[PDB]
Design an enzyme around this catalytic site. Structure first.
Site, PDB file in Angstrom:
ATOM      1  N   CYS A  64     -27.523 -26.543  28.422  1.00  0.00           N
ATOM      2  CA  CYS A  64     -27.285 -24.921  27.585  1.00  0.00           C
ATOM      3  C   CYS A  64     -28.667 -24.426  27.449  1.00  0.00           C
ATOM      4  CB  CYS A  64     -26.508 -25.020  26.388  1.00  0.00           C
ATOM      5  SG  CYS A  64     -26.837 -26.479  24.927  1.00  0.00           S
ATOM      6  N   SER A  65     -29.125 -24.158  26.177  1.00  0.00           N
ATOM      7  CA  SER A  65     -30.432 -23.529  26.094  1.00  0.00           C
ATOM      8  C   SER A  65     -31.265 -24.311  25.408  1.00  0.00           C
ATOM      9  CB  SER A  65     -30.294 -22.109  25.168  1.00  0.00           C
ATOM     10  OG  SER A  65     -31.529 -21.641  25.452  1.00  0.00           O
TER      11      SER A  65
ATOM     12  N   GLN B 224     -22.947 -27.830  17.297  1.00  0.00           N
ATOM     13  CA  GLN B 224     -23.934 -26.972  16.095  1.00  0.00           C
ATOM     14  C   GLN B 224     -23.144 -26.294  15.384  1.00  0.00           C
ATOM     15  OE1 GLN B 224     -27.626 -26.292  15.666  1.00  0.00           O
ATOM     16  NE2 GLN B 224     -27.186 -28.280  15.721  1.00  0.00           N
TER      17      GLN B 224
END
Length: 267
Positions: free
Chosen positions: A198-199, A245
């Site tokens: 992802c990032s 998260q």
């Protein structure tokens, strides 16, 4: 005793997208063959995720493993392809757009449609792009420049419809996507770990990997098998810190598992 010492080294500071999101030393992907001119050439912000269950047998090893990694930086694109080559990965799962809400999440590390590009000593040709509803599939050819018999097809599954805030309101699209990824990976003899990014390499990446792990259990052991989402999440967090998260991501995992079970029952 866990550590993140390699990630913290000054020689690696520009290789991390976020200064305090770092790989555990004991599971990090160590790159053995790079540029001897670079102060450090063995580092990428990536961890091997190996599903570990109390009831695993004495073999080598789990059926599927993953690499959880951050979105490429302009200066780590060559490292990324070294990793894919070294680990014999044949499937990449990209879970972000390149840019979301005006913010780069991942540099475009693959060639334009029908183009070829060299990334350090790695050569990649973009053979084909096929757009599905929630994702695009790119057929890439990866080889080491100068060496014969090194070319191999790498399939990039690019999920494009994850919302700009929060998570999908229904998990069907993600599940259909993972089912395709699953079948591609098993279609290729002894493919390496599935690369998932992802990032930051923890929130979306952790959500996709944990769903895939749970779904793999259910696909095999049936609708009635024992599922423990918090214990599976902790197991994955032991291998890369911070996987999954947000509350929405955490609940999305439960929703996806329930949806998958429901699909199988309707058959």
């Amino acid at each position: 005793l866990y550590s993140r010492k390699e990630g913290q080294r000054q020689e690696n500071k520009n290789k991390n997208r976020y200064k305090n999101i770092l790989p555990f030393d004991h599971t990090r992907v160590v790159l053995h063959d790079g540029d001897p001119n670079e102060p450090v050439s063995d580092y990428i912000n990536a961890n091997i995720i190996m599903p570990e269950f109390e009831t695993k047998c004495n073999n080598s090893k789990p059926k599927k493993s993953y690499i959880a990694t951050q979105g490429c930086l302009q200066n780590t694109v060559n490292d990324f392809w070294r990793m894919v080559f070294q680990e014999n990965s044949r499937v990449i799962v990209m879970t972000t757009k390149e840019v979301e809400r005006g913010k780069s999440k991942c540099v475009k590390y693959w060639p334009d449609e029908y183009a070829l590009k060299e990334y350090g000593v790695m050569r990649v040709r973009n053979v084909k792009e096929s757009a599905a509803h929630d994702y695009t599939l790119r057929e890439l050819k990866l080889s080491k420049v100068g060496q014969g018999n090194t070319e191999r097809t790498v399939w990039q599954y690019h999920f494009r419809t994850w919302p700009d805030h929060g998570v999908p309101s229904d998990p069907g699209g993600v599940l259909d996507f993972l089912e395709e990824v699953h079948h591609k990976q098993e279609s290729i003899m002894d493919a390496g770990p599935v690369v998932v990014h992802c990032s930051a390499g923890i929130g979306r990446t952790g959500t996709f990997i944990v769903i895939d792990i749970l779904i793999d259990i259910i696909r095999e052991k049936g609708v009635d098998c024992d599922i423990d989402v918090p214990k599976t999440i902790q197991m994955v967090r032991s291998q890369r810190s911070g996987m999954v998260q947000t509350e929405a991501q955490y609940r999305f995992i439960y929703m996806a598992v329930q949806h998958y079970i429901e699909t199988l029952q309707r058959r």
